[PDB]
Amino acid sequence: MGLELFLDLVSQPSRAVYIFAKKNGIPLELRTVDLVKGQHKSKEFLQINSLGKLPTLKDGDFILTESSAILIYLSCKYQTPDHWYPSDLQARARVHEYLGWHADCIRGTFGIPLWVQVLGPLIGVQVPEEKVERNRTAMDQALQWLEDKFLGDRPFLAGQQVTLADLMALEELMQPVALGYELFEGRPRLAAWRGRVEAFLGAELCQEAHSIILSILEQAAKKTLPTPSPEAYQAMLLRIARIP
Amino acid sequence: MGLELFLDLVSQPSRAVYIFAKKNGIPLELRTVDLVKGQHKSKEFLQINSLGKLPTLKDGDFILTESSAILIYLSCKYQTPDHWYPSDLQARARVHEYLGWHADCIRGTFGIPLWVQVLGPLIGVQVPEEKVERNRTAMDQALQWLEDKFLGDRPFLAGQQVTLADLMALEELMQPVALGYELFEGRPRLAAWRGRVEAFLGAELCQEAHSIILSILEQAAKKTLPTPSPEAYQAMLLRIARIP
């Protein structure tokens, strides 16, 4: 069974999974893969995940990827509490639905500030003023949508209780926060929901799932960051190259 | 029950759903919403989907969105064949996994040629030469990944049989094709897979699910295209504004 989980806690989807697995007490072998360094691109790793993306979960000789797939798969195999990923047609659908939008509107837009302030400069590459703004006015744009469209009156994006939908959302949101952007400033709805979740999860877990990234801006200043391999350098140039 | 499906067959996710529903014979009330025109933004529609996105499926007073959620939801409620969306842990996982990558790497990159050639100019807005190329070299970049990473030796991205994963993939891919980009040129793997699927689905269905978009380049020429509302004008400028 083994059941190892290659991941880097600077990777927002990685955190999500790690958090889920931890909160439901799932025997997991935490395989650390320095992303900043370019570990996920090491020949040895590509031998595990031809894609070289994190977090990838290896169960048996079955290697899966995609925090969504992994979570869902996990949650299933380990019959985790139902509220998480409900078996109710309407309910599950409500989850499936946000995740899809999340993948569209949240994922990839809220990680940008990290590139603009850390990973970018790390390779001498500086992001254009515009892209920066464009991106932020794009964030709150989504923040709102999330706010009143998904969150609205209820306590969670995916309904009445905590669910994969929240774990993912919040975790992704955490990044710009960690970099200094206080998105929960003028959003008591959002704020309250976050607090509600964190509350649920627990200080301990969150205090450690994050850690890595709240420090990172400093490691950045203190030049503690590893020099990325030419393989990571490439991926990094691409990502930066797809910032609108 | 009603079970209406607002959608515009120029919208690749819309096609997907429509196709699934049609192939499995699901009683569906096809609610057409001119996207090009700006229908999905009409006050009356926002009263149905605060988001104004297509295709949105209204079952009972339950309004759902996200082709993924919809499909899955559909497939469930209408106990459609298992191969589609398997109940097997490894299997389903493999689907869930692609969809996530699909949402990341395919969705949003393969619709661009339509904006560059049609929707864009339709509002006097012309896309920069770079973005164009960047985008295409980005498409085949994904095409390959899809090709040998997901497709590889097996017959489908999601395993051995047709599955939501394919319906969506192929449909999205169809756009640049319909625009004149022959992505299946130097990819016998890709080509064969497509042919495999189309085969399965049937000429009739495909012959009509597409239609709308293979014509569109013409309607474009012949100025048959509806002038978009200031609401659609906005969304159109945003979308174009997020082309890297």
Short mmCIF file of C-alpha atoms in Angstrom, two decimals:
data_model
loop_
_atom_site.label_atom_id
_atom_site.label_comp_id
_atom_site.label_asym_id
_atom_site.label_seq_id
_atom_site.Cartn_x
_atom_site.Cartn_y
_atom_site.Cartn_z
CA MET A 1 0.00 0.00 0.00
CA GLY A 2 2.81 2.36 0.91
CA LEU A 3 0.74 5.44 0.12
CA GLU A 4 3.27 8.21 -0.22
CA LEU A 5 2.49 11.79 -1.07
CA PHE A 6 5.09 13.78 -2.95
CA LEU A 7 4.40 17.45 -2.30
CA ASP A 8 5.88 20.82 -1.43
CA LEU A 9 3.99 22.90 1.14
CA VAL A 10 4.55 26.07 -0.84
CA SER A 11 2.26 24.62 -3.48
CA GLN A 12 -1.28 25.63 -2.56
CA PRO A 13 -2.90 22.44 -3.92
CA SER A 14 -0.27 20.44 -2.05
CA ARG A 15 -1.27 22.10 1.19
CA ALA A 16 -4.94 21.33 0.53
CA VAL A 17 -4.34 17.62 0.12
CA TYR A 18 -1.82 17.45 2.97
CA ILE A 19 -4.39 19.24 5.13
CA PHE A 20 -7.22 16.86 4.17
CA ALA A 21 -5.12 13.76 4.70
CA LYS A 22 -3.88 15.12 8.04
CA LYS A 23 -7.28 16.20 9.36
CA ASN A 24 -8.82 12.81 8.68
CA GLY A 25 -5.80 10.94 9.97
CA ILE A 26 -4.70 9.12 6.86
CA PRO A 27 -1.46 7.11 6.96
CA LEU A 28 0.60 9.14 4.52
CA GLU A 29 4.27 8.97 3.60
CA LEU A 30 5.13 12.62 2.96
CA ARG A 31 7.58 12.69 0.02
CA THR A 32 9.01 16.22 -0.12
CA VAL A 33 9.87 17.65 -3.53
CA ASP A 34 11.47 21.08 -3.58
CA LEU A 35 9.55 22.91 -6.27
CA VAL A 36 11.52 26.17 -6.08
CA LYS A 37 14.61 24.01 -6.52
CA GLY A 38 13.25 22.06 -9.47
CA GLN A 39 12.87 18.68 -7.83
CA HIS A 40 9.57 17.79 -9.47
CA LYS A 41 11.52 17.83 -12.73
CA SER A 42 14.29 15.43 -11.67
CA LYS A 43 14.55 12.44 -14.00
CA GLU A 44 13.88 10.18 -10.99
CA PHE A 45 10.61 11.99 -10.29
CA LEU A 46 9.48 12.07 -13.93
CA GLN A 47 9.88 8.32 -13.55
CA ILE A 48 7.10 8.64 -10.99
CA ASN A 49 5.04 11.36 -12.67
CA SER A 50 5.79 11.87 -16.35
CA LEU A 51 4.22 15.31 -15.82
CA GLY A 52 6.51 16.45 -13.02
CA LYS A 53 3.73 18.27 -11.16
CA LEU A 54 3.00 18.42 -7.39
CA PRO A 55 1.34 16.98 -5.36
CA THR A 56 1.29 13.57 -6.93
CA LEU A 57 -0.02 10.68 -4.84
CA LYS A 58 1.39 7.19 -5.27
CA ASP A 59 -0.77 4.41 -3.86
CA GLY A 60 0.43 0.93 -4.69
CA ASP A 61 1.84 1.27 -8.20
CA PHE A 62 -1.04 3.60 -8.99
CA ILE A 63 0.25 7.15 -9.37
CA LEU A 64 -2.41 9.83 -9.32
CA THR A 65 -2.28 13.59 -9.66
CA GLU A 66 -4.65 16.57 -9.37
CA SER A 67 -5.50 17.68 -5.84
CA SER A 68 -9.13 17.26 -6.85
CA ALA A 69 -8.73 13.67 -8.03
CA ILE A 70 -6.38 12.82 -5.17
CA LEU A 71 -8.69 14.32 -2.50
CA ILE A 72 -11.79 12.65 -3.92
CA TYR A 73 -9.89 9.38 -4.42
CA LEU A 74 -8.47 9.63 -0.88
CA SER A 75 -11.78 10.56 0.72
CA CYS A 76 -13.32 7.57 -1.04
CA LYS A 77 -10.76 4.86 -0.27
CA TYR A 78 -10.57 6.05 3.35
CA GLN A 79 -14.34 6.41 3.77
CA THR A 80 -13.79 9.86 5.30
CA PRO A 81 -16.79 11.73 6.82
CA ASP A 82 -19.57 12.46 4.31
CA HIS A 83 -19.91 16.25 4.84
CA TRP A 84 -16.48 16.46 3.17
CA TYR A 85 -17.55 15.18 -0.21
CA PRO A 86 -21.30 14.39 0.19
CA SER A 87 -22.91 11.43 -1.57
CA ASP A 88 -26.05 13.52 -2.15
CA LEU A 89 -26.82 14.31 -5.81
CA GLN A 90 -27.57 17.96 -5.17
CA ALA A 91 -24.79 18.28 -2.58
CA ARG A 92 -21.95 16.58 -4.47
CA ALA A 93 -23.01 18.47 -7.58
CA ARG A 94 -22.65 21.71 -5.61
CA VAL A 95 -19.10 20.68 -4.79
CA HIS A 96 -18.23 19.46 -8.30
CA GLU A 97 -19.60 22.76 -9.54
CA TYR A 98 -17.43 25.10 -7.46
CA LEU A 99 -14.30 23.02 -8.08
CA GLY A 100 -14.88 23.54 -11.77
CA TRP A 101 -15.24 27.28 -11.37
CA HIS A 102 -12.44 27.24 -8.87
CA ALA A 103 -10.27 25.60 -11.54
CA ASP A 104 -11.35 28.36 -13.85
CA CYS A 105 -11.58 31.48 -11.81
CA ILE A 106 -9.42 30.84 -8.70
CA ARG A 107 -6.63 28.42 -9.59
CA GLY A 108 -3.86 30.18 -11.49
CA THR A 109 -4.90 33.75 -10.68
CA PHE A 110 -4.22 33.75 -6.96
CA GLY A 111 -0.71 32.32 -7.14
CA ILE A 112 0.53 35.16 -9.32
CA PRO A 113 1.58 37.50 -6.48
CA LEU A 114 4.16 34.88 -5.54
CA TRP A 115 5.65 35.07 -9.02
CA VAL A 116 5.53 38.82 -9.00
CA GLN A 117 7.33 39.04 -5.68
CA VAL A 118 9.47 35.93 -5.32
CA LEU A 119 9.78 33.22 -7.98
CA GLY A 120 9.86 35.86 -10.68
CA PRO A 121 12.82 37.94 -9.47
CA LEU A 122 14.52 34.73 -8.33
CA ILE A 123 15.58 34.26 -11.96
CA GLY A 124 16.16 37.91 -12.71
CA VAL A 125 12.71 38.09 -14.34
CA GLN A 126 10.49 41.02 -13.36
CA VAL A 127 6.72 41.05 -14.05
CA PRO A 128 5.21 44.06 -15.90
CA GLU A 129 3.38 46.60 -13.74
CA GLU A 130 0.20 46.02 -15.75
CA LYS A 131 -0.02 42.25 -15.41
CA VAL A 132 0.37 42.89 -11.69
CA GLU A 133 -2.65 45.21 -11.42
CA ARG A 134 -4.65 43.37 -14.05
CA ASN A 135 -4.10 40.31 -11.87
CA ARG A 136 -5.13 41.91 -8.58
CA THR A 137 -8.27 43.62 -9.94
CA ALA A 138 -8.86 40.12 -11.32
CA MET A 139 -8.50 38.58 -7.86
CA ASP A 140 -11.05 40.66 -6.00
CA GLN A 141 -13.18 40.29 -9.10
CA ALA A 142 -13.22 36.56 -8.31
CA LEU A 143 -13.21 37.24 -4.59
CA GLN A 144 -16.59 38.93 -4.92
CA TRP A 145 -18.08 36.23 -7.17
CA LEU A 146 -16.92 33.71 -4.59
CA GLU A 147 -18.23 35.94 -1.84
CA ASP A 148 -21.84 36.59 -2.71
CA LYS A 149 -22.37 33.96 -5.43
CA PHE A 150 -20.93 30.88 -3.70
CA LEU A 151 -20.65 31.89 -0.09
CA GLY A 152 -23.61 34.23 0.16
CA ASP A 153 -25.75 33.65 3.26
CA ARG A 154 -24.70 30.04 3.87
CA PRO A 155 -21.48 29.26 5.80
CA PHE A 156 -19.53 27.49 3.02
CA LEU A 157 -18.95 27.77 -0.69
CA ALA A 158 -20.14 24.19 -1.07
CA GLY A 159 -23.20 24.41 1.17
CA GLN A 160 -23.68 24.12 4.92
CA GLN A 161 -20.56 22.28 6.03
CA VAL A 162 -16.84 22.23 5.34
CA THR A 163 -16.07 20.42 2.11
CA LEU A 164 -13.22 19.85 -0.34
CA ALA A 165 -14.51 23.02 -2.00
CA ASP A 166 -13.49 25.09 1.03
CA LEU A 167 -10.17 23.43 1.78
CA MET A 168 -9.05 24.13 -1.78
CA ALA A 169 -10.48 27.62 -2.07
CA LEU A 170 -9.05 28.85 1.24
CA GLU A 171 -5.64 27.27 0.64
CA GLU A 172 -5.29 28.93 -2.77
CA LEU A 173 -6.46 32.15 -1.27
CA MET A 174 -3.77 31.85 1.39
CA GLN A 175 -0.92 32.60 -0.99
CA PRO A 176 -1.42 36.32 -1.76
CA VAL A 177 -2.30 36.61 1.94
CA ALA A 178 1.03 35.11 2.90
CA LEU A 179 2.73 37.52 0.46
CA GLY A 180 1.14 40.55 2.12
CA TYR A 181 -2.21 40.98 0.29
CA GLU A 182 -4.99 41.15 2.87
CA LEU A 183 -7.89 39.98 0.70
CA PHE A 184 -10.13 39.51 3.73
CA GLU A 185 -9.95 43.21 4.48
CA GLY A 186 -13.24 44.53 3.15
CA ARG A 187 -14.99 41.18 3.08
CA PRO A 188 -16.56 40.24 6.42
CA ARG A 189 -18.46 37.54 4.57
CA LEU A 190 -15.22 36.04 3.22
CA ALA A 191 -13.38 36.76 6.46
CA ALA A 192 -16.04 35.12 8.60
CA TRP A 193 -16.13 32.08 6.32
CA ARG A 194 -12.35 31.69 6.46
CA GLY A 195 -12.32 32.01 10.22
CA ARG A 196 -15.15 29.53 10.39
CA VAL A 197 -13.09 27.02 8.38
CA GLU A 198 -9.73 27.57 10.07
CA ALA A 199 -11.72 27.26 13.27
CA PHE A 200 -13.01 23.88 12.18
CA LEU A 201 -9.64 22.62 10.95
CA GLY A 202 -7.62 23.68 13.96
CA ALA A 203 -4.74 26.03 14.76
CA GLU A 204 -2.18 23.26 14.92
CA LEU A 205 -2.78 21.98 11.41
CA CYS A 206 -3.12 25.37 9.75
CA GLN A 207 -0.23 26.78 11.80
CA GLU A 208 1.96 24.19 10.07
CA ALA A 209 0.31 23.60 6.67
CA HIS A 210 1.02 27.24 5.94
CA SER A 211 4.23 28.14 7.79
CA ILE A 212 6.44 27.44 4.77
CA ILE A 213 4.83 30.15 2.66
CA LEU A 214 4.40 32.87 5.28
CA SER A 215 8.12 32.60 5.86
CA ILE A 216 9.06 32.47 2.17
CA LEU A 217 8.85 36.24 1.58
CA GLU A 218 11.73 36.51 4.08
CA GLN A 219 13.76 33.54 2.80
CA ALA A 220 13.32 35.57 -0.35
CA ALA A 221 14.90 38.69 1.20
CA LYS A 222 17.60 36.66 2.96
CA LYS A 223 18.53 34.96 -0.30
CA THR A 224 17.80 31.59 1.36
CA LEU A 225 16.00 30.42 -1.78
CA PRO A 226 17.57 27.56 -3.80
CA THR A 227 18.73 28.35 -7.30
CA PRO A 228 16.33 26.57 -9.67
CA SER A 229 17.64 23.97 -12.09
CA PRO A 230 17.48 24.70 -15.82
CA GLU A 231 14.42 22.43 -15.86
CA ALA A 232 12.67 24.54 -13.21
CA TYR A 233 13.98 27.65 -14.89
CA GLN A 234 12.05 26.60 -18.00
CA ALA A 235 8.76 25.84 -16.26
CA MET A 236 9.13 29.14 -14.41
CA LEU A 237 9.60 31.07 -17.65
CA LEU A 238 6.52 29.42 -19.09
CA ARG A 239 4.29 30.13 -16.14
CA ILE A 240 5.48 33.72 -16.10
CA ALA A 241 4.95 33.75 -19.84
CA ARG A 242 1.28 32.95 -19.39
CA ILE A 243 0.50 35.81 -17.03
CA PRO A 244 -1.93 38.07 -18.96
CA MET B 1 -38.75 18.03 -13.43
CA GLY B 2 -38.73 20.16 -16.55
CA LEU B 3 -35.00 19.68 -17.05
CA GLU B 4 -34.04 22.44 -19.45
CA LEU B 5 -30.57 23.10 -20.71
CA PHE B 6 -29.66 26.65 -21.63
CA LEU B 7 -26.72 26.48 -24.02
CA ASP B 8 -25.21 27.80 -27.23
CA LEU B 9 -23.60 25.22 -29.52
CA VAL B 10 -20.71 27.55 -30.30
CA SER B 11 -19.65 27.13 -26.69
CA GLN B 12 -17.42 24.04 -26.55
CA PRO B 13 -18.54 22.95 -23.05
CA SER B 14 -22.11 23.43 -24.16
CA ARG B 15 -21.53 21.03 -27.04
CA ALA B 16 -20.01 18.46 -24.70
CA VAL B 17 -23.03 18.39 -22.42
CA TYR B 18 -25.53 18.54 -25.27
CA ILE B 19 -23.65 15.63 -26.85
CA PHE B 20 -23.65 13.53 -23.66
CA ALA B 21 -27.33 14.17 -22.98
CA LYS B 22 -28.18 13.39 -26.61
CA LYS B 23 -26.11 10.21 -26.89
CA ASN B 24 -27.65 8.72 -23.76
CA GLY B 25 -31.13 9.85 -24.69
CA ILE B 26 -31.94 12.20 -21.87
CA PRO B 27 -35.20 14.20 -22.01
CA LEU B 28 -33.78 17.70 -22.29
CA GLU B 29 -35.42 21.02 -22.97
CA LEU B 30 -32.83 22.86 -25.07
CA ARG B 31 -32.87 26.50 -23.97
CA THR B 32 -30.85 28.44 -26.56
CA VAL B 33 -28.90 31.48 -25.37
CA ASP B 34 -27.07 33.45 -28.06
CA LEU B 35 -23.67 34.03 -26.54
CA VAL B 36 -22.25 36.10 -29.38
CA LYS B 37 -25.31 38.29 -28.99
CA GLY B 38 -24.97 38.63 -25.24
CA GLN B 39 -28.01 36.62 -24.21
CA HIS B 40 -26.40 34.87 -21.23
CA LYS B 41 -26.13 38.36 -19.73
CA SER B 42 -29.80 39.35 -20.10
CA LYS B 43 -31.37 40.31 -16.78
CA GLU B 44 -33.91 37.49 -17.23
CA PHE B 45 -31.10 34.96 -17.55
CA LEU B 46 -29.06 36.29 -14.61
CA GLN B 47 -32.31 35.59 -12.78
CA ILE B 48 -31.62 31.95 -13.67
CA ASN B 49 -27.80 31.98 -13.34
CA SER B 50 -26.41 34.91 -11.37
CA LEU B 51 -23.18 34.09 -13.22
CA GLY B 52 -24.52 34.39 -16.74
CA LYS B 53 -22.36 31.54 -18.06
CA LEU B 54 -23.32 28.74 -20.49
CA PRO B 55 -24.35 25.92 -20.42
CA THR B 56 -26.38 26.11 -17.26
CA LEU B 57 -28.76 23.23 -16.47
CA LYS B 58 -31.96 23.84 -14.60
CA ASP B 59 -33.53 20.73 -13.09
CA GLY B 60 -36.49 21.42 -10.86
CA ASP B 61 -35.62 24.70 -9.14
CA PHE B 62 -32.05 23.48 -8.85
CA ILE B 63 -29.85 25.45 -11.26
CA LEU B 64 -26.45 23.92 -11.88
CA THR B 65 -23.48 25.08 -13.96
CA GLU B 66 -20.09 23.69 -15.04
CA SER B 67 -20.17 21.14 -17.84
CA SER B 68 -18.21 18.84 -15.50
CA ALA B 69 -20.70 19.14 -12.64
CA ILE B 70 -23.65 19.01 -15.05
CA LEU B 71 -22.33 15.91 -16.91
CA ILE B 72 -21.49 14.08 -13.72
CA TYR B 73 -24.78 15.17 -12.16
CA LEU B 74 -26.64 14.14 -15.31
CA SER B 75 -24.87 10.81 -15.68
CA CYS B 76 -25.71 10.09 -12.06
CA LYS B 77 -29.42 10.99 -11.98
CA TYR B 78 -29.97 9.19 -15.28
CA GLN B 79 -27.88 6.13 -14.33
CA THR B 80 -26.13 6.34 -17.72
CA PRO B 81 -23.68 3.52 -18.74
CA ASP B 82 -20.76 3.08 -16.35
CA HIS B 83 -17.89 3.30 -18.86
CA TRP B 84 -18.82 6.98 -19.17
CA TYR B 85 -18.02 7.96 -15.61
CA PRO B 86 -16.84 4.68 -13.93
CA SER B 87 -17.61 3.87 -10.29
CA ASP B 88 -14.18 2.25 -9.94
CA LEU B 89 -11.79 4.07 -7.58
CA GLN B 90 -8.82 3.89 -9.93
CA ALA B 91 -11.03 4.50 -12.98
CA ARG B 92 -13.06 7.46 -11.75
CA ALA B 93 -9.86 8.91 -10.29
CA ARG B 94 -8.29 8.73 -13.78
CA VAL B 95 -11.22 10.71 -15.12
CA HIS B 96 -11.32 13.28 -12.30
CA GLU B 97 -7.58 13.66 -12.86
CA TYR B 98 -7.71 14.53 -16.54
CA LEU B 99 -10.66 16.91 -16.11
CA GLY B 100 -8.59 18.84 -13.60
CA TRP B 101 -5.63 19.07 -15.99
CA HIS B 102 -8.04 19.68 -18.79
CA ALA B 103 -9.44 22.63 -16.81
CA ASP B 104 -5.86 23.77 -16.38
CA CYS B 105 -4.13 23.04 -19.61
CA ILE B 106 -6.90 22.66 -22.23
CA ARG B 107 -9.86 24.81 -21.26
CA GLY B 108 -9.12 28.47 -21.99
CA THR B 109 -6.21 27.94 -24.36
CA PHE B 110 -7.98 26.19 -27.23
CA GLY B 111 -10.81 28.66 -27.67
CA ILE B 112 -8.44 31.53 -28.28
CA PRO B 113 -8.25 31.11 -32.09
CA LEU B 114 -11.94 31.98 -32.17
CA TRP B 115 -11.28 35.26 -30.42
CA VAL B 116 -8.31 35.95 -32.64
CA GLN B 117 -10.34 35.32 -35.80
CA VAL B 118 -13.93 36.13 -34.97
CA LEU B 119 -15.16 37.40 -31.63
CA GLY B 120 -12.14 39.66 -31.38
CA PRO B 121 -12.54 41.68 -34.58
CA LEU B 122 -16.34 41.55 -34.18
CA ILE B 123 -15.82 44.42 -31.73
CA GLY B 124 -13.05 46.14 -33.63
CA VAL B 125 -10.53 44.57 -31.23
CA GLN B 126 -7.53 42.88 -32.86
CA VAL B 127 -5.32 40.40 -30.97
CA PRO B 128 -1.50 41.01 -30.91
CA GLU B 129 0.57 38.85 -33.22
CA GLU B 130 2.54 37.49 -30.22
CA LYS B 131 -0.39 36.34 -28.10
CA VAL B 132 -1.49 34.48 -31.22
CA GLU B 133 1.72 32.50 -31.63
CA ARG B 134 2.37 32.18 -27.91
CA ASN B 135 -1.10 30.65 -27.81
CA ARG B 136 -0.59 28.17 -30.65
CA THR B 137 2.83 26.98 -29.53
CA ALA B 138 0.93 26.64 -26.26
CA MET B 139 -1.74 24.49 -27.85
CA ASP B 140 0.47 21.87 -29.42
CA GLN B 141 2.47 22.02 -26.20
CA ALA B 142 -0.71 20.73 -24.51
CA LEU B 143 -1.60 18.57 -27.47
CA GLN B 144 1.58 16.57 -26.96
CA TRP B 145 1.11 16.23 -23.19
CA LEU B 146 -2.39 15.05 -23.94
CA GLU B 147 -1.06 12.80 -26.69
CA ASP B 148 1.66 10.72 -25.05
CA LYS B 149 0.92 11.43 -21.36
CA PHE B 150 -2.86 10.83 -21.28
CA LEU B 151 -3.57 9.03 -24.52
CA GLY B 152 -0.35 7.10 -24.92
CA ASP B 153 -0.88 3.49 -26.01
CA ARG B 154 -4.41 3.11 -24.61
CA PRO B 155 -7.41 4.26 -26.72
CA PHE B 156 -8.73 7.07 -24.49
CA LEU B 157 -7.40 9.83 -22.29
CA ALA B 158 -9.37 8.38 -19.40
CA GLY B 159 -8.45 4.72 -19.90
CA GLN B 160 -9.90 2.03 -22.16
CA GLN B 161 -13.34 3.35 -23.05
CA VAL B 162 -15.03 6.61 -23.98
CA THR B 163 -15.60 8.76 -20.94
CA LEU B 164 -16.57 12.30 -19.97
CA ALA B 165 -12.85 13.01 -20.22
CA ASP B 166 -12.96 12.40 -23.99
CA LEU B 167 -16.22 14.14 -24.79
CA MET B 168 -14.90 17.31 -23.19
CA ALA B 169 -11.35 17.09 -24.54
CA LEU B 170 -12.40 16.46 -28.11
CA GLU B 171 -15.12 19.10 -28.05
CA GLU B 172 -12.74 21.80 -26.84
CA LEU B 173 -10.21 20.69 -29.40
CA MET B 174 -12.84 21.06 -32.10
CA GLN B 175 -12.81 24.84 -31.97
CA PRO B 176 -9.39 25.71 -33.48
CA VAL B 177 -10.11 22.87 -35.90
CA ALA B 178 -13.35 24.50 -36.98
CA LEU B 179 -11.36 27.76 -37.28
CA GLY B 180 -8.97 26.14 -39.73
CA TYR B 181 -6.21 24.83 -37.40
CA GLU B 182 -5.61 21.18 -38.23
CA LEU B 183 -4.20 20.02 -34.89
CA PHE B 184 -4.58 16.38 -35.88
CA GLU B 185 -2.10 16.83 -38.71
CA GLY B 186 1.11 15.38 -37.27
CA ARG B 187 -0.52 13.39 -34.49
CA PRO B 188 -1.71 9.95 -35.66
CA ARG B 189 -2.11 9.12 -32.00
CA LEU B 190 -4.41 12.11 -31.47
CA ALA B 191 -6.07 11.69 -34.84
CA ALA B 192 -6.75 7.97 -34.32
CA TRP B 193 -8.16 8.68 -30.86
CA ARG B 194 -10.47 11.36 -32.21
CA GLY B 195 -11.60 9.13 -35.06
CA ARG B 196 -12.11 6.44 -32.47
CA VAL B 197 -14.43 8.65 -30.42
CA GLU B 198 -16.34 10.29 -33.28
CA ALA B 199 -16.76 6.76 -34.53
CA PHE B 200 -18.34 5.72 -31.24
CA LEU B 201 -20.56 8.78 -30.92
CA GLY B 202 -21.90 8.71 -34.48
CA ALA B 203 -21.87 10.94 -37.55
CA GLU B 204 -25.39 12.25 -37.01
CA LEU B 205 -24.72 13.64 -33.52
CA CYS B 206 -21.32 15.10 -34.26
CA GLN B 207 -22.50 16.35 -37.67
CA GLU B 208 -24.96 18.52 -35.76
CA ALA B 209 -23.30 19.18 -32.40
CA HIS B 210 -20.58 20.99 -34.34
CA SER B 211 -22.24 22.50 -37.41
CA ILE B 212 -22.73 25.87 -35.72
CA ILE B 213 -19.01 26.50 -35.28
CA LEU B 214 -17.69 25.15 -38.59
CA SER B 215 -20.04 27.60 -40.26
CA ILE B 216 -19.22 30.51 -37.99
CA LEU B 217 -15.99 31.52 -39.79
CA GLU B 218 -18.28 32.23 -42.75
CA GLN B 219 -21.07 33.99 -40.89
CA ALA B 220 -18.07 35.99 -39.78
CA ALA B 221 -17.14 36.80 -43.38
CA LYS B 222 -20.71 37.46 -44.37
CA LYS B 223 -21.26 39.80 -41.44
CA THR B 224 -24.14 37.53 -40.28
CA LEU B 225 -22.85 37.83 -36.72
CA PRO B 226 -25.12 39.58 -34.16
CA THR B 227 -23.79 42.80 -32.65
CA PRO B 228 -23.05 42.05 -28.99
CA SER B 229 -24.78 43.94 -26.21
CA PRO B 230 -22.73 46.27 -24.00
CA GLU B 231 -22.93 43.46 -21.45
CA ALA B 232 -21.42 40.97 -23.86
CA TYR B 233 -19.03 43.67 -25.07
CA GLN B 234 -17.65 43.81 -21.53
CA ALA B 235 -17.16 40.11 -21.00
CA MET B 236 -15.58 39.97 -24.48
CA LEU B 237 -13.07 42.65 -23.55
CA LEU B 238 -12.22 40.87 -20.32
CA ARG B 239 -11.67 37.50 -21.95
CA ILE B 240 -9.50 39.12 -24.60
CA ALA B 241 -7.79 41.03 -21.82
CA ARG B 242 -6.72 37.77 -20.22
CA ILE B 243 -5.02 36.36 -23.27
CA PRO B 244 -1.32 36.14 -22.37
#
